[PDB]
Scaffold this active site. Structure first.
Site, short mmCIF file in Angstrom:
data_model
loop_
_atom_site.label_atom_id
_atom_site.label_comp_id
_atom_site.label_asym_id
_atom_site.label_seq_id
_atom_site.Cartn_x
_atom_site.Cartn_y
_atom_site.Cartn_z
N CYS A 54 98.51 117.41 58.31
CA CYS A 54 98.07 116.18 58.48
C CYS A 54 98.44 115.24 56.96
O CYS A 54 99.03 114.03 57.46
CB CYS A 54 96.60 115.91 58.19
SG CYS A 54 95.88 116.78 59.75
N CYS A 63 97.31 119.68 46.65
CA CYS A 63 98.39 118.69 47.27
C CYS A 63 99.91 118.79 46.84
O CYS A 63 99.79 118.79 45.34
CB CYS A 63 98.02 117.36 47.42
SG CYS A 63 98.99 116.62 48.58
N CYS A 95 84.19 117.82 72.84
CA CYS A 95 85.46 117.35 73.47
C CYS A 95 86.19 118.56 74.01
O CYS A 95 87.60 118.33 74.15
CB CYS A 95 86.05 116.57 72.73
SG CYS A 95 87.37 117.21 71.35
N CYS A 109 94.26 123.34 54.36
CA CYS A 109 95.06 123.05 55.45
C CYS A 109 96.43 123.14 54.54
O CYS A 109 97.40 123.35 55.24
CB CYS A 109 94.90 121.82 56.01
SG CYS A 109 93.40 121.64 56.80
N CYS A 156 87.14 122.48 70.13
CA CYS A 156 86.85 123.85 69.46
C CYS A 156 87.57 124.90 70.09
O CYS A 156 88.27 125.78 69.65
CB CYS A 156 85.60 124.06 69.27
SG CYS A 156 84.55 122.98 68.17
N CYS A 184 87.58 119.07 62.89
CA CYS A 184 87.71 118.40 64.09
C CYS A 184 89.04 117.99 64.42
O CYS A 184 89.77 117.03 64.44
CB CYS A 184 87.04 116.95 63.94
SG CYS A 184 86.72 116.00 65.35
N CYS A 197 81.25 118.45 64.99
CA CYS A 197 80.05 117.92 65.72
C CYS A 197 78.76 118.84 65.72
O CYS A 197 77.87 118.36 65.60
CB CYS A 197 80.66 117.81 67.13
SG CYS A 197 81.89 116.50 67.52
N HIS A 220 93.14 117.49 47.64
CA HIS A 220 93.83 116.76 46.44
C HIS A 220 94.34 117.93 45.47
O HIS A 220 95.69 117.89 44.93
CB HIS A 220 93.10 116.02 45.75
CG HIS A 220 93.52 114.87 45.11
ND1 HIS A 220 94.48 113.78 45.51
CD2 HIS A 220 93.84 114.86 43.78
CE1 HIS A 220 94.80 112.83 44.52
NE2 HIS A 220 94.46 113.74 43.46
N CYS A 280 95.28 112.50 55.64
CA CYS A 280 93.82 113.48 55.77
C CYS A 280 92.78 112.49 56.12
O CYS A 280 92.82 111.61 55.22
CB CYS A 280 93.85 114.28 54.50
SG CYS A 280 92.53 115.44 54.71
N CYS A 319 88.36 115.73 58.00
CA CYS A 319 87.63 115.76 59.21
C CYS A 319 86.48 117.18 59.11
O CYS A 319 85.46 117.49 59.94
CB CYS A 319 88.70 116.37 60.34
SG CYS A 319 89.38 117.92 60.18
N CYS A 358 102.80 109.58 47.33
CA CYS A 358 101.63 109.99 47.74
C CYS A 358 100.74 109.13 48.63
O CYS A 358 101.32 107.84 48.78
CB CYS A 358 100.47 110.03 46.66
SG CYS A 358 98.92 110.11 46.81
N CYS A 408 94.75 108.35 52.65
CA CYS A 408 94.55 109.79 52.67
C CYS A 408 93.24 110.18 52.08
O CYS A 408 92.68 109.47 51.14
CB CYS A 408 95.61 110.66 51.91
SG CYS A 408 95.12 112.26 51.67
#
Ligand code: SF4
Ligand code: SF4
Ligand code: FCO
Ligand SMILES: [Cl-]
Ligand SMILES: [Fe+2]
Ligand SMILES: [Kr]
Ligand SMILES: [Kr]
Ligand SMILES: [Kr]
Ligand SMILES: [Kr]
Ligand SMILES: [Kr]
Ligand SMILES: [Kr]
Ligand SMILES: [Kr]
Ligand SMILES: [Kr]
Ligand SMILES: [Kr]
Ligand SMILES: [Kr]
Ligand SMILES: [Kr]
Ligand code: NI
Ligand SMILES: [S]
Lengths: 481, 277
Positions: B253, B205, B12, B241, B15, B153, B115, B202, B259, B262, B226, B232
């Site tokens: 996210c 988190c 798409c 992340c 990237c 992604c 992908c 997690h 989340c 991805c 949470c 999530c």
């Protein structure tokens, strides 16, 4: 005589596009556009929790995912019967608007501008056509370059504006059915406004100017690419919670003649696309997607849309034409100063120049300014802390439709639910209106048409074939999905 | 600067776009000082049969020394017709055809996005293209070229830029196949570099306390609790992340909504529905 040139891949676009032109007398006389890659989100989406759509459909395109998230939730909203909080509505427009800016800056500077500017002596800016037709001075060209390098950080910032309330970009997490998932805090409305001002300044000071500056050296380019001179807009960025006033209001223009927009006059033909003959001509609500990759005569994965038999075009020009808003300040000056022309609304550019290779580039630079005004108007309307989302219940059986305007033109998603799971989803997207092959009557797609008469003085260097195409801002991922 | 070819298939263009958001180094520094980008259909000046020819030249020039980036999955069905990338010498090139021509002769192959790495969305439940992950495609055609997966992604720019560097610096220190062995060593079982995908969301988190208390959010806009009940997928996702966050750090996210994991091989089907526990 008749010489056939093939350009595959057309670069500095998004996605897989082959363009085929036949040349006699130094002009294009027939074209054929092929979309060479297919995924079929329209079947992939079948069977899923409807709320998955708001993520899956962004992976259609990486440049304009918020146009897809937006079209999608709008449909789901309808199908679920959700009421989007007023303060959610605005938050959505702020997430989407910031990427219009990002998309349009990206297109000109990093996709098109090299049509007119010699970058540095490092790959990927060479090797390039010997007789490229780059007419800018050593000074204007080094100014063209300095700004490209600058757009790299402006567009990167627009994606931080998006990401403040969307979560990330590309592929926001923030737009869902019911509204937006994060309430703007006073703190972050500053974060956004700080960046917005840096962007406001660049667009007003550098981008809009340089499109006219460069345009006036290429005044011959306003005389080609007219195509069917028909345009489509379907409305975008709702201004009320009722669905009546919109930033772009819908409308069609074909044969000097304005008309209203009727989505039921939409049908997707597939004679020349690699899709099963037995599906041609349907409307989106009855759509099916059956790939036929070995079909004789078909030459594109992009379906052939027509609006009441018309082959229309979509995008900035198409939007700015239908709405005919008042031209920006920086634009009225340099039209006087460099073109020697007096205009106060858009249509004062006239049908021929507006609908020209270099007239669409300009619509896109003018439309961006229009958005500086929309976003500044929403940063006043937004109210920190007020609720943005409602948490609806999944309908067992429902149907919805979301209409909006992606950066590249009209986009719509239609959804049919059954036993609370997706039974049908259909997408009519911007680049599907521009880059489509012929319909069943042999009528050419809007761009296929626009290519006729394009100067190919130099069959070895057919740089204008690709200059016309790029002016439309194509996304062959959005076309095919 | 080593030569890089960037080949899109069923992508798409995500990237590429996330890479343009790399802050430090900005993409401009990456392009001018880190790598020689010799082919990328989206950003490059030349086009058409010319644009391919320049690649085969550089490819034949630097046999065993060019780096090959693949965005999007490889659709094998219909003889490769579901993803045509070019035409040269009046013959059209599938992604299958291209990955065959160039895959063998590369120093390494970087599968970018979920992908390419794992197949992802075009390979998901409801697809009829035979969309295949890079690493699987190559083995099934005998090619032994090393493959590094940088999933996402989209992937965060740092995960990519990050991966390029730590391989060139692995090559500077130990020469080529020496660096490539070091590069293959810092991978978990899913071909991912552990610098970026070695920690769980997690387990790190900041709402983990709310998880253990059993306080969950009832609406998304409720940033107190949470997010597990909203759907999530942090519990089964491996990515950093939570640390570096997204788009210059302006959000991410879990904070923003949920989340969806991805970065994981089963994305999207194994992680759907996205919005239920
Ligand atoms: S379920 Fe999500 S929000 Fe809750 S602790 Fe795990 S990663 Fe954090
Ligand atoms: S937090 Fe999860 S959903 Fe968000 S980018 Fe990281 S892996 Fe993807
Ligand atoms: N902008 C964008 Fe993508 C396209 N064309 C959509 O809709
Ligand atoms: Cl968008
Ligand atoms: Fe469609
Ligand atoms: Kr770029
Ligand atoms: Kr440029
Ligand atoms: Kr420029
Ligand atoms: Kr001005
Ligand atoms: Kr790039
Ligand atoms: Kr891009
Ligand atoms: Kr650059
Ligand atoms: Kr770039
Ligand atoms: Kr590598
Ligand atoms: Kr890179
Ligand atoms: Kr690398
Ligand atoms: Ni798109
Ligand atoms: S796009």
């Amino acid at each position: 005589g008749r010489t056939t040139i093939a350009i595959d891949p057309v670069t500095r676009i998004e996605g897989h596009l082959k363009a085929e032109v036949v040349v006699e007398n130094g002009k294009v006389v027939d074209a054929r556009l092929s979309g060479g890659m297919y995924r079929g989100f329209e079947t992939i989406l079948r069977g899923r929790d409807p709320r998955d759509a708001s993520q899956i459909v962004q992976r259609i395109c990486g440049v304009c995912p918020t146009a897809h998230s937006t079209a999608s939730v709008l449909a789901l909203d309808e199908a679920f019967g959700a009421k989007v909080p007023n303060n959610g509505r605005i938050t959505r427009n702020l997430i989407f608007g910031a990427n219009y800016l990002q998309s349009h800056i990206l297109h000109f500077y990093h996709l098109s501008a090299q049509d007119f500017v010699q970058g540095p002596d490092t790959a990927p800016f060479v090797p390039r056509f010997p007789k490229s037709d780059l007419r800018l001075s050593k000074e204007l060209n080094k100014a063209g370059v300095d700004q490209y390098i600058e757009a790299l950080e402006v567009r990167r910032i627009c994606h931080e504006m998006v990401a403040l309330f969307g979560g990330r970009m590309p592929h926001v997490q923030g737009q869902v059915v019911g509204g937006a998932t994060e309430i703007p805090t006073k703190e972050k409305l500053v974060e956004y406004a700080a960046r917005f001002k840096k962007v406001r300044d660049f667009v007003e000071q550098k981008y809009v100017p340089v499109v006219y500056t460069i345009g006036s050296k290429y005044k011959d380019m306003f005389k080609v690419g007219q195509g069917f001179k028909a345009a489509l807009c379907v409305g975008a960025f709702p201004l009320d919670n009722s669905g009546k006033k919109h930033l772009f209001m819908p409308g069609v223009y074909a044969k000097g003649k304005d008309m209203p927009f009727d989505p039921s006059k939409i049908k997707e033909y597939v004679k020349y696309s690699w899709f099963a003959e037995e599906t041609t001509g349907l409307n989106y609500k009855e759509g099916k997607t059956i790939p036929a990759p070995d079909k004789a005569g078909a030459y594109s994965f992009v379906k052939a849309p027509r609006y009441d038999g018309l082959s229309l075009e979509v995008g900035p020009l198409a939007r700015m034409w239908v709405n005919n808003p008042e031209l920006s300040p920086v634009g009225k000056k340099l039209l006087k100063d460099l073109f020697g022309i007096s205009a106060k609304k858009f249509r004062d550019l006239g049908e021929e120049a507006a609908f020209s290779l270099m007239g669409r580039h300009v619509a896109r630079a003018e439309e961006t300014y229009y958005m500086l005004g929309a976003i500044e108007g929403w940063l006043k309307e937004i109210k920190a802390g007020e609720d943005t989302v409602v948490m609806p219940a999944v309908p067992a059986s429902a149907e919805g439709t979301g209409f909006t305007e992606a950066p590249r033109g009209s986009l719509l998603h239609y959804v049919k639910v059954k036993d609370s799971k997706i039974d049908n989803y259909q997408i009519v997207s911007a680049s599907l209106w521009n880059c489509n092959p012929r319909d069943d009557m042999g009528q050419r797609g809007a761009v296929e048409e626009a290519l006729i008469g394009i100067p190919v003085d130099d069959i070895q260097n057919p740089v204008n074939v690709a200059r016309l195409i790029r002016a439309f801002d194509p996304x062959l991922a959005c076309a095919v999905h | 600067r080593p030569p890089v070819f960037w080949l899109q298939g069923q992508g798409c263009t995500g990237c590429s776009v996330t890479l343009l958001n790399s802050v430090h180094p900005s993409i401009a520094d990456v392009l001018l000082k880190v790598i020689s980008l010799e082919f990328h259909p989206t950003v490059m000046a030349w086009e058409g049969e010319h644009a391919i020819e320049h690649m085969r030249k550089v490819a034949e020039k630097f046999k065993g020394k060019f780096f090959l980036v693949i965005e999007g999955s490889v659709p094998v069905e219909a003889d490769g017709k579901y993803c045509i990338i070019g035409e040269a010498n009046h013959h059209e090139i599938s992604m299958v055809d291209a990955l065959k021509e160039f895959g063998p002769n590369a120093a390494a192959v970087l599968a970018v996005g979920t992908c390419a790495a794992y197949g992802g969305i075009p390979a998901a439940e409801g697809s009829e293209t035979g969309a295949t992950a890079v690493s699987k495609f190559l083995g099934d055609n005998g090619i032994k070229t090393p493959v590094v997966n940088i999933p996402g992604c989209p992937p965060h720019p740092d995960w990519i830029v990050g991966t390029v560097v730590l391989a060139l610096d692995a090559i500077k220190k130990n020469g080529l196949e020496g660096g490539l062995a070091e590069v293959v060593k810092v991978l978990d079982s899913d071909g991912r570099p552990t610098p970026f995908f070695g920690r769980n969301i997690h387990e790190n988190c900041p709402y983990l306390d709310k998880y253990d208390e059993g306080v969950m959010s009832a609406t998304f806009t409720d940033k107190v609790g949470c997010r597990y009940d909203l759907g999530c997928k942090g519990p089964m996702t491996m990515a950093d992340c939570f640390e570096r966050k997204w788009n210059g750090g302006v959000n991410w996210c879990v904070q923003n909504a949920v989340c969806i994991g991805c970065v994981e091989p089963d994305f999207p089907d194994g992680k759907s529905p996205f919005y239920q526990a």
